[PDB]
């Protein structure tokens, strides 16, 4: 199974890695699928594409935009 | 984070209870977010409509 | 343009169909597409299924 | 590697099993993706839940309801 | 709650922000939903990778590439 | 029809063409769909965000 994530752009690839790690062993754990069935992908969205309230999280000084700069 | 599993049916509600929880807390402990702002929901799939290999699971179930 | 929303199921039809329109005109309204380019579907999540929090909404609605 | 398929609900259980056929023989034909990492998730969308520029499907008479028949 | 948008690549930030702004507008006013809690996901495909009718969005003069260019 | 399929980065332009008439011809081919009506994109991956087993793509690919 499969497990889709979108979160605003910014974290590094370590955070990423052990994002899929924890994702999968908790999957793993909680409903007994096998490690080798378990999909996991990250989609970072630009603080320019993410909306939070009718928002964009740029406006809000959240997150990096596409070439990982800061507000 | 927005958290979006896509699940075979199957799986009990209490299950389901347990997996919301579980890959929430996953995300609080890898990249540190901040419990409330997680968003994780499961999309059931019937086993006719999912597909390893060319096969759907309904069928190598069989 | 192909919009996707999420929603826990408790809609009515009605509700829907007026969901659909206003995120289409929303859409044409907002960056000029055609209306015949914009695709909207509701993906409705059972209460069992959808978390805030770590809590699924189903559990939060027990009192 | 992953296949995502949405549409409107009324497809046969036949017309899934063909669908999930061709588009992993796709994937496997084209890129040389190993037909074992190969899934595909489809997704029945009912027709008061999918809109055509504005209009949902079943005002536009396709498709069937969340019940499994309609006009 | 949750809204995701796909679309070809080339949508300025404005208009980005615009959208998010109006589909937000849009899910409050018609069923009500608390204004805090609508999220709005934007997923620029580039052209290269998002398909008409079979020809992707690029070989049909449409959008930006991955790096941000036109198709001239 | 929609049909989006998560790639890993690395595939060609000229591949990424190929594929998504391919996926476009299989749905008209599998289902009856007007080839105008199918909607077919990829969603691109870089390899440290696409994880197999709890392992990234990159992980994988750098242990042969």
């Keep these: 199974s499969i497990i889709q994530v979108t979160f605003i752009a910014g974290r590094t690839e370590l955070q990423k890695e052990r994002l899929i790690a924890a994702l999968t062993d908790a999957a793993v754990d909680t409903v007994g699928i096998e490690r080798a069935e378990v999909r996991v992908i990250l989609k970072d969205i630009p603080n320019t594409d993410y909306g939070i309230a009718g928002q964009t999280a740029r406006s809000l000084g959240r997150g990096v935009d596409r070439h990982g700069r800061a507000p | ?62």
Tied chains: 1, 4.
């Design chain 2, 1 to 62: 984070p927005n958290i979006e599993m896509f699940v075979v049916e199957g799986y009990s509600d209490q299950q389901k209870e347990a997996l919301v929880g579980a890959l929430t807390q996953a995300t609080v402990e890898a990249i540190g977010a901040p419990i409330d702002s997680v968003r994780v929901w499961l999309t059931e799939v019937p086993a006719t409509q999912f597909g390893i290999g060319g096969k759907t699971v309904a069928a190598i179930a069989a």
